[PDB]
């Protein structure tokens, strides 16, 4: 599967061959609650933790399944 991981210059999509292929799309506050915007980090894990005590953390294990609300394949 592929993974829209926000890591390099643009959204860098990487295919995780091993067992860990889960695409997480977690979010918290990165100036939105402050001034700019919310936090968005997309990666490829094996066990996406459910950190919903304040940060919106989603878990999807499918090719390019971790796209964010602000920017996405338009």
């Amino acid at each position: 599967i592929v993974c829209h991981t926000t890591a390099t210059s643009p959204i860098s999509a990487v295919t995780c061959p091993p067992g860990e292929n889960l695409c997480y799309r977690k979010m918290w506050c990165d100036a939105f609650c402050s001034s700019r915007g919310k936090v968005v980090e997309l990666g490829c894990a094996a066990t996406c933790p459910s950190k919903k005590p304040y940060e919106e953390v989603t878990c999807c294990s499918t090719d390019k399944c971790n796209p964010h609300p602000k920017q996405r394949p338009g």
């Binding site: 991981t5 926000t6 890591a7 390099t8 210059s9 643009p10 959204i11 860098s12 979010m27 990165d30 100036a31 939105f32 700019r36 915007g37 919310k38 936090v39 968005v40 980090e41 997309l42 964010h68 609300p69 602000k70 920017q71």
Partner: peptide, 25 residues
């Protein structure tokens, strides 16, 4: 010129105002 790593800072809010993280020099 960019023989380093990859880091990103995406904030939900502005489709045209993403903050990236890459080594300049």
């Amino acid at each position: 010129e960019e023989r380093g790593w990859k880091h990103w800072v995406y904030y939900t809010c502005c489709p045209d105002t993403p903050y990236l993280d890459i080594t300049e020099e």
